[PDB]
Design a protein around this ligand. Structure first.
Ligand code: BTN
Length: 237
């Protein structure tokens, strides 16, 4: 997979999209730092030197996008496990979390955009970048956890290798789509929790998380069982 390695850019997602609009496919845009990194729904994503910031552009018909959406977080988890001894988990939708002192802090996130012919998967992982003092309460870096500077090159390389082997096992039919979902549920720290979810239509849904599937989250609320697509969830607390 072709990798365009930049020293800086506004956002790897936005730049990957311009290139994708013009025809490019199956490539990655990696940037040592971002001047305007973006998170889900209007969030800013601090992208100082030391972090891993890249966007993968894939053919929309390479495989089921809904399956890919679950595969990405899974691969990140399994790759980071090789570097961290602490508990890793997935917070709905795709926050990559690490347990610290009976507390979960965010190590990274995923921002995805899907079009008819391609999907852009933006991945941000806090590796050696310094987390702003204010949010050190909810965010953390791998360097803070391990006590050592990790190699961002190796991390990316292992992520890609892991992601591709899974891709080849799915198409080769060595593993079912459901097995990917089972891995997701295994790492999910959201299922079984009582939550208040803010949606993009201003509604707030409160309830017990029974399950998360390829389409979204399933909650037991006052109204009964409610299903919510992951793409419209602005905030989950
Ligand atoms: O947790 C989130 O809200 C999503 C964060 C996504 C961050 C990555 S960094 C690479 C890519 N470029 C961006 O501007 N955002 C994504």
């Amino acid at each position: 997979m072709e990798i365009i390695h930049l020293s800086e850019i506004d956002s790897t997602n936005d730049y990957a999209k311009e290139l994708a609009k013009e025809g490019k496919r199956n490539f990655i845009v990696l940037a040592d730092k971002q001047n305007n990194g973006k998170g889900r729904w209007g969030r800013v994503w601090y992208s100082d030197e030391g972090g891993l910031y890249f966007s993968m552009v894939l053919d929309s018909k390479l495989y089921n996008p809904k399956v890919i959406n679950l595969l990405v977080p899974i691969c990140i988890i399994e790759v980071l496990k090789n570097y961290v001894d602490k508990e890793l988990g997935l917070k709905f939708p795709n926050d990559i979390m690490v347990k610290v002192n009976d507390n979960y802090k965010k190590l990274g996130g995923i921002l995805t955009e899907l079009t008819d012919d391609y999907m852009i998967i933006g991945i941000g992982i806090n590796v050696n970048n310094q987390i702003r003092n204010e949010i050190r309460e909810i965010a953390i870096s791998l360097k803070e956890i391990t006590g050592k500077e990790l190699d961002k090159v190796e991390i990316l390389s292992n992520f890609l290798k892991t992601f591709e082997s899974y891709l080849e096992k799915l198409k080769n039919k060595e593993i079912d789509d459901y097995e990917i979902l089972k891995k997701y549920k295994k790492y999910s720290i959201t299922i079984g929790k009582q939550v208040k979810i803010l949606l993009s239509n201003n509604e707030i849904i409160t309830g017990k998380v029974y399950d998360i599937d390829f389409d979204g989250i399933v909650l037991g609320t006052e109204k009964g069982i409610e299903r919510i697509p992951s793409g419209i969830c602005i905030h989950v607390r």
